């Protein structure tokens, strides 16, 4: 059924399982107008969808030119995600495709469990998690992709660089929400971490920099800080 | 006028004809049940004083034979026959008639209630779904299962209701995956009206026996197809006038029947409150939402 803390581990078994989340398909700035009323502006967006075990990331970009002369977009962007994860599942090999797909909002759950009635067989899970997928955007190679992007497009990473080579996925996961948590709470910050040494860099193919283990250990521990004290200084304490 | 004649009432028993009921005392000399207007079809049902458990009936129309009424001491129950021989009936109706040992069912002649609840419920199309056919009449219980229920175990006991699924492919035409969805007009037209029943009586016959199957048997799943079929209608975007004030009515009727002290089991808050207030016909069931809000206010 729902995903939550009791049943954490099995995200690193060996049955095939995607995340979606549909948190940023729809993108508006929001501004007046000549008249002095309000409209809103889409910006292109994506699909964040990820193999917690691998570290594929399966980016699908979302042109604004999808919404034009749409109405009810925010409903429309639930199916519209549904309907790019299940041609997504259709690309696949079977070997490839994933036993389930657990959603991040479950407003998704029934946009995704009719595009993918050709898949009995795939689970379709919600999830009681916090997770952050969301601050994904707050990731630079991340938002330029999608922010110069002319046309759909499906882009691929591997949101771990090289971490498996060294780390178990359970301990990569961890390491990915701690940084997408902290971003998420104070962007500002969590960057100046990540960057305050310039001797430490970012490979061309990589998302993240280039720590040893000792400088992820002293990374991951003031991303902590940084959680707790966004925390005080909004509930102070 | 027809007969359902009894050979004896040896169990205390509540018995039911349509929308009446009366207690019969064990072992009062009872002879059954007189006056039936032709015409329709009809419902005989028992609770037994000794176990509430186990509503039970016989759906039945007095044209297609002569039938009768004799409990079974081995399987426990009042049993319905057909008489075949038919001046061995008539003879024995006016022997019991004469010594009056027949209740009345009692049609007060403003009152077009049972026809209301019954417009379009047929016996040749009830045994389309209770299956047992070298029977002219269907026996019905309160447990018996759905051959919906039954995918989610014994299919000669069956209610072969017409089988709805919203998730479905059926009910989703690949590519309109949005479209079919949020709108079942294709489903509801298309799919059930032009595919299934062929008209839109027939639909709303199996609806109209879906709900008394629930009522007076509280058949439960019975009540899960009376709001299936009652949910495809509010959740579809085009329906023809007509239906939707025949809709109306049919379902104004029933609210209006159900016993007061049954809604909380028998009435699905999810369908109505979608159906009267947020479904494309919320605006359409002016009958039906009038009556729900002056009688149960309380589930909205
Ligand atoms: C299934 C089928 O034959 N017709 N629908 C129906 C109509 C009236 C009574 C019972 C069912």
Same mark, same amino acid.
Request: hydrophobic share 40%; charged share 25%; aromatic share 12%.
């Given at each position: ?32 107008? +000549? ?48 309907? &790019? ?9 079977? &070997? ?22 050709? +898949? ?8 009681? %998690?916090?997770?952050? +997928? ?38 990569? +996961? ?12 104070? &962007? @500002? ?24 283990? @000792? ?10 800080? %940084?959680?707790?004290? &966004? ?7 | 006028?027809?007969?359902?004649? $009894? ?6 028993? =509540? ?6 009921? $009366?207690?019969?005392? *064990? #072992? ?37 034979? #002569? ?23 008539? #003879? ?27 417009? $379009? ?15 002219? /009449? ?7 299962? =759905?051959?919906? *229920? ?65 009522? /007076? ?20 975007? =085009? ?7 025949? !809709? ?8 209006? =029947? !159900? ?23 919320? #605006?359409?069931?002016?009958?039906? *939402? ?11």
């Amino acid at each position: 059924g729902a995903m939550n803390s009791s049943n954490y581990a099995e995200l690193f078994n060996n049955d095939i399982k995607l995340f979606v989340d549909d948190t940023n398909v729809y993108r508006v700035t929001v501004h007046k107008t +000549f008249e002095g009323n309000v409209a809103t502006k889409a910006i292109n967006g994506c699909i964040f969808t990820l193999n917690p075990k691998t570290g594929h990331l399966f980016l699908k970009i979302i042109h604004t030119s999808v919404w034009a002369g749409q109405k009810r977009l925010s409903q429309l962007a639930k199916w519209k995600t549904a309907e &790019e994860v299940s041609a997504l599942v259709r690309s696949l090999p079977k &070997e490839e495709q994933p036993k389930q797909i657990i959603v991040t909002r479950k407003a998704m759950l029934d946009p995704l469990e009719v595009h993918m009635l050709d +898949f009995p067989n795939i689970a379709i899970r919600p999830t009681e %998690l916090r997770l952050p +997928f969301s601050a994904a955007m707050s990731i630079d190679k991340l938002s330029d992709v999608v922010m110069k992007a002319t046309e759909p497009q499906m882009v691929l990473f591997n949101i771990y660089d090289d971490w498996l080579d060294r780390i178990s996925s359970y301990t990569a +996961f961890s390491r990915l929400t701690l940084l997408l948590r902290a971003l998420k709470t104070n &962007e @500002e910050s969590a960057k100046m971490i990540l960057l305050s040494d310039p001797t430490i860099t970012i490979k061309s193919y990589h998302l993240w920099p280039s720590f040893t283990d @000792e400088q992820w250990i002293t990374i991951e521990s003031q991303m902590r800080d %940084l959680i707790l004290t &966004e925390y005080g200084r909004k509930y102070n304490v | 006028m027809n007969t359902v004649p $009894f050979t004896s009432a040896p169990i205390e028993v =509540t018995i039911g004809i349509d929308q009446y009921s $009366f207690n019969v005392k *064990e #072992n009062q000399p009872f002879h059954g049940i007189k006056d039936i207007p032709i015409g329709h079809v009809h419902v005989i049902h028992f609770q037994h004083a000794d176990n509430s458990s186990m509503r039970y009936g016989y759906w039945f129309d007095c044209r297609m034979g #002569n039938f009768y009424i004799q409990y079974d001491p081995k399987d426990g129950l009042y049993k319905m026959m057909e008489e075949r021989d038919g001046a061995k009936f008539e #003879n024995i109706v006016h022997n019991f008639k004469e010594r009056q040992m027949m209740v009345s069912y009692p049609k007060i002649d403003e009152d077009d209630t049972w026809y209301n609840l019954t417009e $379009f419920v047929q016996m040749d199309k009830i045994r389309k779904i209770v299956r047992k056919d070298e029977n002219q /009449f269907s026996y019905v219980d309160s447990s018996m299962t =759905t051959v919906q *229920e039954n995918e989610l175990s014994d299919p000669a006991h069956s209610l072969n209701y017409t089988v709805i699924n919203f998730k479905s492919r059926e009910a989703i035409r690949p590519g309109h995956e949005m479209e079919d969805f949020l709108d079942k007009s294709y489903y509801l037209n298309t799919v059930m009206l032009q595919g299934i029943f062929k008209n839109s009586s027939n639909y709303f016959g199996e609806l109209q026996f879906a709900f008394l199957n629930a009522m /007076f048997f509280g058949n439960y799943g019975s009540s899960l197809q009376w709001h299936a079929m009652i949910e495809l209608i509010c959740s579809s975007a =085009t329906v023809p006038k007509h239906m939707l004030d025949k !809709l109306d009515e049919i379902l104004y009727y029933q609210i209006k =029947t !159900l016993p007061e002290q049954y809604s909380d089991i028998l009435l699905n808050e999810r369908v109505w409150n979608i159906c009267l207030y947020s479904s494309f016909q919320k #605006n359409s069931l002016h009958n039906t *939402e009038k009556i729900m809000e002056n009688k149960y206010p309380e589930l909205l």
